[PDB]
Every structure is written in C-alpha cells, then in structure tokens.
C-alpha cells in the first residue's frame, strides 16, 4: 500500500476519542502516503502543487434544547511563510429550529457537512479540519467523518 507516487491522505476520526475530532491514519480504507504526514492532528504538505482537499463531518442529536446551537466545519491552511492561518473551506449548519419539543418526544436529528475544493499549497503547509462542537459528532459508523487531500 500503495502504487501511485501522488501524495495522498484520506483520514478518518477516532471514535474512542471523546470530546474532540482526532484523525486516525492507521485503519480501514485510510490513506497517508508519498510524503504526506499527520502530525499535530493536521495534514502536512510535502510539495508545492495543486491539491484537492475534502472533508465531511456528520453531526447528530436527539431533540432540541436551548433555542440555538449552530454547527460549523472548516478547513484551514496554516502556512510556512504566512505563519498565520486562514479558512479555505467553511460551512455552518442549523439543526432543530428552537423547536424544543417541550410537549414531549425527542427525535433523532442528523446533519452532515461537506467541504471540497482545489487549492495551491506550498511544501510544509499544514492543513487543518476543525469543528466547533465535537461532542455532537456521530462516531458510530464507518464512512461518516473524514478528511482527505490528493496532489494533482
């Protein structure tokens, strides 16, 4: 694992890592090859180039509480020159609209968020996939939350 010399990573969340989004490389159909590395939980670029970056996250809950919580998912670039950080891809999601079924009955809600796009990156740039409310993640099943990149 694996032929193709194009730097790649498709990484997946740690379910047994409560309270945060941790990316596991050592699993299933997870990738991490040709110079790409996973380090302070960030994907690290081995070469100047064009890269497709994607991530999906899946939030869940049962019923609605305090008027509003908003879920967000972003991919940041932190750069070797620009020692600072910027969003390449973002998205906010609002599940249950205050509803608060205070009559009764609490239903399952699920809210996925997909981020994808092509960016030019420099050797040693660090990519970061973050969310605001890690405790609303679904850690129960396979292809549900993940973070990938590939050189073109």
């Amino acid at each position, epitope marked *: 694992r694996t032929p193709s010399d194009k730097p790649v990573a498709h990484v997946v969340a740690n*379910p*047994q890592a*409560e309270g945060q989004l941790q990316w596991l490389n050592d699993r299933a159909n997870a990738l991490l090859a040709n110079g790409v590395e996973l380090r302070d939980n960030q994907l690290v670029v081995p070469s100047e180039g064009l890269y497709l970056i994607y991530s999906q996250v899946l939030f869940k*809950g*049962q*019923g609605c509480p305090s008027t509003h919580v908003l879920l967000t998912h972003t991919i940041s670039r932190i750069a070797v020159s620009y020692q600072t950080k910027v969003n390449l891809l973002s998205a906010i999601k609002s599940p249950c609209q205050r509803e608060t079924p205070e009559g*009764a*009955e*609490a239903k*399952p809600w699920y809210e996925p968020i997909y981020l994808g796009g092509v960016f030019q990156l420099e050797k040693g740039d660090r990519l970061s996939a973050e969310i605001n409310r890690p*405790d609303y993640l*679904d*850690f*129960a*099943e*396979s*292809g549900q939350v993940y973070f990938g990149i590939i050189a073109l």
Partner: antibody
Framework: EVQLVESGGGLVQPGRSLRLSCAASGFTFDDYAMHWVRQAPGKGLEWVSAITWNSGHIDYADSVEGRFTISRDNAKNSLYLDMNSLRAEDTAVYYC??????????????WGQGTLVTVSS | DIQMTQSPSSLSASVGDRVTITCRASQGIRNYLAWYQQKPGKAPKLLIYAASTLQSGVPSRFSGSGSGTDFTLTISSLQPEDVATYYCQRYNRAPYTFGQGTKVEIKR
C-alpha cells in the same frame, strides 16, 4: 405485527460452532440495523454485536471480534450469528433486537424471545 | 471503556409507592440512554429512549430524566406488574453496554 423469531440454539461441544437465526416480519427489515444481545443464566444483559441496514458496518464486543460473525440476508429478512470456537462463557440466551431508528446507535425497540445455547460436552 | 452503573442493585417497595432507579455513566453520553424492562424469563421491553421519551404503549407512570452522565428511571406509583429487572443502556457509539441491572420487588 413485529416478530423476531429466533432459532439455531442447542447443545454444543466446546470448540465446535453454531449458526443462530432470527427471522423478522411485520416491518421493512431492510430499513433497520439489528443487534445481538446475550444473557448468561442468572447473569445480566451483555451486548454482543450489531450490523447496519446494508451490512456496511459491523461492531462486536471487547470480548469476541474473532469468534463470532454477524450477517444479514435482506431478501429472506433474516439476521444471522455464526459463532466459532465456543466456550462456557458463551453459554447464554441470545436475543435479536430491532433498532428504533435506522442506525446501529439507536435504542433496541423490539426483541425476539431468545434462544438458549448450552456449551457442554 | 465506559461503565454503566445503576444504583441500587435491588429494591423492595409498596404498591403505590414511587420508585427511583439511577444510572451513572463513566463518560458523558448526551441523552443516548435507554431503559429496558425485563420480566422473569421473558424478553426485555424498551421503556424509555433518549433519557425521557416513553416508548409508545408504555404506561405513563414510568418516567426518565438526565443528560450526560446521571440518569433516572422513575415509577410514580409502583404496581404489581411492575415487578421486573430494569437495565439502562448506552447507545452513542459502540459498545452498546448495559448497566448491571436492578431488581424490583413489592410490599404486600
């Protein structure tokens, strides 16, 4: 209405093996994850494994993984558990349970009547 | 990991008396907790899911509460048929582990 009919239980020499069955009816079986839950005699309830609607994900217990194999025929509306290399600790009544809402991570909304499996020479 | 711990392990009570069973999780599980009733030899039945939502067709004297780690099954007026063993269950997240159980018994 919803029925989960177990079969496959019985006596078995330790080291040998068994294929439990659970025949579902009264609900579109294809839309639900299923669970196996065992209960050793006098002991309490203990989750065993689970399988999603399309069989794409499977979980087992900090206690098996290598020995048991949950499976599912949707045409036959059936849930299977193939147990291998059996020891006395596997001796228990085994329940199949239909989940409440789709995902494996949902409440066990309906159970079969059980089927006892006695491991003994 | 995860420990589902229900107290007490056993309780006797008077018909009509209100009964309280508690469940503490060793790590938060939001409201991904259900209560199951199991009568002697019978298959267990789901009473509450999402901590507080009664299953349809389940008498309303049964109630639940709690989010996070501490949960409470309550029978507001114990009844002769309520004699059973009750189990809480985690469902987030596998493994879907059950508390050790709580036997319920009566006055007369």
């Amino acid at each position: 209405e919803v029925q989960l009919v177990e079969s496959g239980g019985g006596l078995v020499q330790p080291g040998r093996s068994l294929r439990l069955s659970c025949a579902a009816s009264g609900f579109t079986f294809d839309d639900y994850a299923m669970h196996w839950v065992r209960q050793a005699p006098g002991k309490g309830l203990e989750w065993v494994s689970a399988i999603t609607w399309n069989s794409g994900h499977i979980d087992y217990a900090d206690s098996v993984e290598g020995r048991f194999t949950i499976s599912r025929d949707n045409a036959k509306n059936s849930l299977y558990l193939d147990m291998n290399s059996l020891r006395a600790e596997d001796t228990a009544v085994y329940y199949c349970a239909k989940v409440s809402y789709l995902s494996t991570a949902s409440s066990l909304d309906y159970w079969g009547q059980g089927t006892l499996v006695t491991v003994s020479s | 990991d995860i420990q589902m711990t229900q107290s007490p392990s056993s309780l006797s009570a008077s018909v009509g008396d209100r009964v309280t069973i508690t469940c503490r999780a060793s790590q938060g599980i939001r409201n991904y907790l259900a209560w199951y009733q199991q009568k002697p030899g019978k298959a267990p039945k789901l009473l509450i899911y999402a901590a507080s939502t009664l299953q349809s067709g389940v008498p309303s004297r049964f109630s639940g509460s709690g989010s996070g780690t501490d949960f409470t099954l309550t029978i507001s007026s114990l009844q002769p048929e309520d004699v059973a063993t009750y189990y809480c269950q985690r469902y987030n997240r596998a493994p879907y582990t059950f508390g050790q159980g709580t036997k319920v018994e009566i006055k007369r």
